[PDB]
């Protein structure tokens with residue numbers, strides 16, 4: 027791209043527990059815990075009872091060192107920068123006897139001019155990582171109260187003093203692994219004249235006819251003379267130039283601000299997943315001096331995103347308008363993919379986005395107890411058409427608000443805003459998760475003096491109502507900011523539900539039935555959720571067979587919700603027969619979470635436009651654990667993820683039964699209206715015999731972006747109470763010429779009340795490298811079938827579905843570990859098998 031040379035400092039590192047003088051090979055980027063694990067100096071932290079056994083690490087200081095060679099020629103370049111994309115967290119950086127930096131914020135990248143400190147030949151880099159526990163003990167002692175951060179799993183809630191990923195201190199689905207290290211890459215750049223410090227592509231306006239952009243460059247010139255230069259911006263699409271602009275300047279020593287307008291006529295818009303292609307242009311900025319001394323590019327999506335948050339007849343709306351069209355949000359809350367962040371590989375990020383795209387999602391919330399994610403995450407969101415709701419990294423406790431603390435926060439806000447603001451995917455900023463809710467409703471006023479409580483309330487405003495919104499206004503002026511989620515609505519207070527976004531924890535924490543999701547509607551659901559144990563192959567990863575009990579010491583290790591096991595059983599009993607065996611209980615628990623949650627996803631879509639989105643808690647897991655996730659740590663889809671896919675389908679037939687009556691809604695997130703449609707239904711018993719006749723509803727239209735009721739019928743006079751326990755309703759939607767565009771099945775009774783027949787699911791299999799193809803058959807209904815295989819992360823065309831009587835079903839399973847001539851073990855489970 028330019029004349030600079032980059033040296034990756036990613037080999038030859040060593041580490042030491044401070045004070046031991048013993049050094050061993052390390053892997054950078056990485057973590058202290060991983061380095062110890064790689065030397066068998068820690069047990070597998072995710073196995074068994076090992077959490078307590080690895081806590082000692084957090085009390086030690088840890089040192090890292092590397093050496094590297096610099097040549098006479100490199101030392102003669104105009105400038106040389108050492109760049110740390112991430113240091114976790116209190117890190118003193120020494121090079122060649124100079125203290126370069128005292129780092130104090132995990133979320134900040136540092137760029138350090140070092141030419142004057144480098145030497146020809148060998149150069150020595152040492153980094154000292156202070157324990158973030160020891161570092162903040164004096165700070166806590168001076169504070170005179172303990173912040174109410176219940177998720178910080180220690181007597182002393184030290185997390186709040188450090189700009190370090192909150193979840194690292196523990197969470198209610200998380201292991202405590204308060205780690206340290208060089209967590210993102212370290213690079214040396216040797217260059218001439220200048221670097222581009224920042225390149226911002228600011229969209230001024232966008233119409234079907236024209237996109238107007240402002241290319242804003244910050245150029246840091248390292249030489250003392252004045253340097254004539256030409257700044258060039260090339261805009262290309264698929265390798266073909268669309269427009270090119272240039273500007274003559276004379277670069278002054280230090281910072282230069284350069285602005286170049288560019289326009290794209292008849293722009294091809296970036297669309298979100300479901301509404302078209304996520305088209306990305308390539309914008310390249312170069313600085314040319316007589317040689318291209320500096321270049322930087324971004325992929326750019328041309329679209330408008332407006333968050334509409336306005337007083338209205340129902341309270342206060344909260345929805346996303348994309349390219350001028352209101353878009354119903356369908357997605358999930360994302361947490362960190364690992365207890366050890368550098369262990370998350372490119373392939374894991376790619377697979378997680380494939381999981382979101384395949385489940386018909388169009389939005390992800392990067393929840394405030396994790397990290398501002400790596401550039402790759404947002405690059406994947408851009409190319410998959412997934413909108414990103416970005417929390418700042420504050421969650422579930424008030425935080426300090428003293429000048430030094432706020433200076434750290436300002437540093438991370440500026441850094442990460444400039445880092446992320448060029449992504450098409452980035453849709454909004456949110457100051458924190460649940461802090462105002464906590465301050466108002468979680469009973470802190472009983473835990474603190476009135477004076478300390480007042481201090482907390484004032485401190486909330488300084489950070490979330492002043493500093494963060496001001497920073498967004500300055501650096502990302504056309505993106506929405508809200509101070510907290512949920513900003514006003516509280517789940518126990520019905521009068522607040524028509525006001526902005528909800529975290530409806532009435533289900534789960536409030537013990538409310540899943541049916542409450544049909545009546546208790548938000549303007550936008552930013553969280554709701556339900557736990558499940560992950561499937562047996564995941565349990566087997568952390569537990570020996572002796573430990574396969576809900577309440578074994580090892581299982582309780584991997585359940586961080588102290589009320590979770592009791593809630594799961596309570597809810598299961600409402601709808602299912604509780605199985606006697608642990609393995610069957612796990613299977614039904616997956617079914618339960620899937621069925622209950624999808625009932626909610628369907629209510630939210632059905633109630634558009636009153637409700638304009640749903641983001642369930644939670645997408646994913648950081649380690650093998652019992653949690654609210656739809657995908658376990660090993661990437662296995664739980665039932666919930668298949669159910670989410672189905673409930674988020676662009677066109678959905680939603681039968682909803684209440685008060686002994688059935689309505690059927692047709693729900694569409696398509697941009698086009700469907701005309702002359704037929705809804706066809708029929709009642710089929712569990713033996714496959716049709717009851718009565720086919721019901722047909724002709725001449726239906728399904729307008730773009732609407733939910734509409736097309737059919738209502740009382741059950742009384744149609745089906746006997748006996749019919750209701752022994753049959754299901756099949757529903758199909760077809761176009762004028764008879765082609766199927768959607769299908770659904772409906773049960774008229776709770777599963778535990780169904781008279782399911784004993785039945786065998788037989789299968790045929792054709793296995794080749796990487797692939798099994800199964801054909802399943804049962805002469806009778808098999809309810810909520812789970813096709814279980816021992817291969818971690820195996821992918822299925824479908825799973826957790828009802829196998830209908832006499833209706834053959836093909837299922838493809840893929841995994842790089844499937845070998846032709848090593849038959850894939852397959853175990854098919856279904857509800858009736860779970861009891862006698």
Ligand SMILES: O=C1NC[C@H](CO)[C@@H](O)[C@@H]1O
Pocket residue numbers: 197198199395421422459460553643654
């Ligand atoms: O934002 C949140 N809401 C509820 C989750 C489960 O208790 C919790 O893990 C998360 O902090």
Ligand SMILES: [Br-]
Pocket residue numbers: 104105106107139140141142248
């Ligand atoms: Br320099």
Ligand SMILES: [Br-]
Pocket residue numbers: 156
């Ligand atoms: Br220090």
Ligand SMILES: [Br-]
Pocket residue numbers: 281282283284
């Ligand atoms: Br300037």
Ligand SMILES: [Br-]
Pocket residue numbers: 298299300301353388695
């Ligand atoms: Br969509």
Ligand SMILES: [Br-]
Pocket residue numbers: 490491492495508509
């Ligand atoms: Br605000």
Ligand SMILES: [Cl-]
Pocket residue numbers: 107137138139
């Ligand atoms: Cl610099």
Ligand SMILES: [Cl-]
Pocket residue numbers: 335336337342
């Ligand atoms: Cl408002």
Ligand SMILES: [Cl-]
Pocket residue numbers: 170171473474475478
């Ligand atoms: Cl107090």
Ligand SMILES: [Cl-]
Pocket residue numbers: 681682683684
């Ligand atoms: Cl229903």
Ligand SMILES: [Cl-]
Pocket residue numbers: 683684685686687
């Ligand atoms: Cl009913």
Ligand SMILES: [Cl-]
Pocket residue numbers: 783784785786858859
């Ligand atoms: Cl059976």
